[PDB]
Amino acid sequence: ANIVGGIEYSINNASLCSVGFSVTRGATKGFVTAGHCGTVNATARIGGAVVGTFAARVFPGNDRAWVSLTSAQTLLPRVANGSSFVTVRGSTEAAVGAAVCRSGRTTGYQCGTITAKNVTANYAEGAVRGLTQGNACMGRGDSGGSWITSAGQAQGVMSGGNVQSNGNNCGIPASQRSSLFERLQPILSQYGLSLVTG
Amino acid sequence: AAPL
């Protein structure tokens, strides 16, 4: 399968998540995603075919994971934007007030701004600290998806937020949204990963 | 807040 940020993948034929970013670890291909999406050795599938397995993850505390892929996977330095793509150029971290977009299998590509950093989300499973908050909307299924600036600087992967009864926070004003992502920087260093860029 |  072609690995692009924002597309759907399933875990052990059950849950769905979104791909964050294509990366490599030496000769190994992978993608970064949300920790809450799977446990170590869980099976990742894209369009019904097995593409790899969870190599590692941290959740709760943090919300991160990387999936090692088989060799036949094609890593691409891109993030889905409808039918078009945003080119991954690096990982400079943007500051509070910067505009950012996020891509995922449920609500597609949504943009907004970063409103706060170092937020704690109290999930039922336990607290997740150090999240950055934006006001782009998202829905169930978007987790693990890419957060990127229009300039191509990768920011992190979708963790969670304040979803309403319809499954997203797209029906509430930007001012009331709390959409949290895990920073990409600590995930790349923690696993020794390099981002695929174009 | 929920994970996703």
Cβ(A19)–Cβ(A144) below 8 Å: yes
Question: How close, in Å, is residue A26 to chain B by CA atoms?
Answer: 30
Question: How is residue A59 written in tokens?
Answer: 């959740």
- CB neighbours of residue A17 within 10 Å: 26
SS3 label, residue A70: coil
- CB neighbours of residue A112 within 10 Å: 18
Question: CA A162, CA A137: separation in Å to the nearest integer?
Answer: 9
What is the number of residues in chain A? 198
What b-and-e string marks burial along A172-195, b requiring 16 or more CB atoms within 10 Å of the CB?
Answer: eeeeebbbbbbbbeebbeebebeb
Question: How is residue A38 written in tokens?
Answer: 């799977």
Burial of B2 (0-12, 13-18, 19+ CB in 10 A): middle
Q: Which chain B residue has its CA at the smallest distance from A182's CA? A: B3
Stretch 1-4 of chain B: residues touching chain A, C-beta under 8 Å: 1-3
The domains of chain A, with CATH numbers, are: 3-76+184-196 (2.40.10.10), 77-183 (2.40.10.10)
What is the number of residues in chain B? 4
Beta strands in A70-136 (DSSP E): 74-81, 84-87, 99-104, 108-123, 126-134
Q: Please report, for residues A33, A34, A144, the alpha-carbon distance to residue A10 in angstroms, rounded to integers and kept in the order given.
A: 12, 13, 12
Cβ(A161)–Cβ(A174) below 8 Å: no
DSSP A97: T
Resolution, in Å, please? Answer: 2.2
Going by their DSSP bridges, the two strands A74-81 and A2-5 should be labelled as parallel
Amino acid at site A155: Q
Amino acid at site A185: Q
Judge: B1–A63 Cβ closer than 8 Å, yes or no.
Answer: no
* Size of the A and B interface in Cβ pairs below 8 Å: 24
Cis check for the bond before A60: say yes or no (omega within 30 of 0): yes
Question: CA A124, CA A129: separation in Å to the nearest integer?
Answer: 14
Catalytic-residue membership of A63: yes
**Alpha-carbon dihedral sign for residues A60, A146, A154, A137:** negative
Report the candidate in A91, A130, A94 with the shortest Cα–Cα distance to residue A114: A94
Report the candidate in A173, A111, A178 with the shortest Cα–Cα distance to residue A146: A111
Cβ(A20)–Cβ(A49) below 8 Å: no
Stretch 41-60 of chain A: residues touching chain B, C-beta under 8 Å: 59
Return the residue matching tokens 């999936």.
Answer: A67
Residues from chain A that touch B3, judged by Cβ atoms under 8 A, are 34, 36, 59, 63, 121, 123, 125, 128, 143, 159-160
Candidate list A22, A68, A143, A159, residue with the active-site label: A143
Question: CA A108, CA A29: separation in Å to the nearest integer?
Answer: 25
Cβ(A63)–Cβ(A76) below 8 Å: no
Amino acid at site A39: T
Cβ neighbors of A95 (< 8 A, separation 6 or more) are: A114
Return the residue matching tokens 């793509």.
Answer: A85
Return the residue matching tokens 């949290």.
Answer: A180
